[PDB]
Amino acid sequence: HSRSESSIENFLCRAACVYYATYTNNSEKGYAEWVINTRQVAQLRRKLELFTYLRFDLELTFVITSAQQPSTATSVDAPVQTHQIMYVPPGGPVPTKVTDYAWQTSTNPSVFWTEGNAPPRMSIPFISIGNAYSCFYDGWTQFSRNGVYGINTLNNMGTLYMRHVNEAGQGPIKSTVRIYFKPKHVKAWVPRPPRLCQYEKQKNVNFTPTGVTTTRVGITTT
């Protein structure tokens, strides 16, 4: 009877991997970085793109897993590994190395998490300049109707950096951080047709045309 599970809140409020990247133990410049967009993954992108304008808070879950890489030493002992995830809002200083001053995060929020514990989680508010997030943008970045065309003239959400706080281990360890978004308290407007053609690029709608549906033999075929 009830249409409860088909509410927008239930539809979108499930964690989804939006991106995942890797970094190395000592390395040299073994830090990772990610400009935050929601269009690199197909599943979440389609769910969000069923609507033109959205508004919601976010639940961020990080799943960080490491693995031993080959080494030449005798019996390398792994001490527990701690990681730092720093958020650099647009305009802030950017880490250029694993031992940069930016990592001090006096103002920039960041998480310190030790392996073997519950995955770290953070909620974040509605961070938009406008009165709603924009899923599509039929315009340009420059008033001369030139420069960039699409939603990447709007996307400016800052960067996300990843590093080992532990370091110098006698044997190398490679880590993989997986970012997960879960929209909370969602508000959607102007529904639009589901995506039909496979996604091609994260920064534009560009598609390769495909057929409307699967095919059958005859109109009376069953």
């Binding site: 809140e9 239930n10 409020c13 808070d57 976010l58 909620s123 974040i124 508010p125 509605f126 909370k184 308290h185």
Partner: peptide, 17 residues
């Protein structure tokens, strides 16, 4: 029974009901 522990509304659970 649902009590909110955080000072910021964004920290709350989903509006499931």
């Amino acid at each position: 029974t649902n009590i909110n522990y955080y000072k910021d509304a964004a920290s709350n659970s989903a509006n499931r009901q």
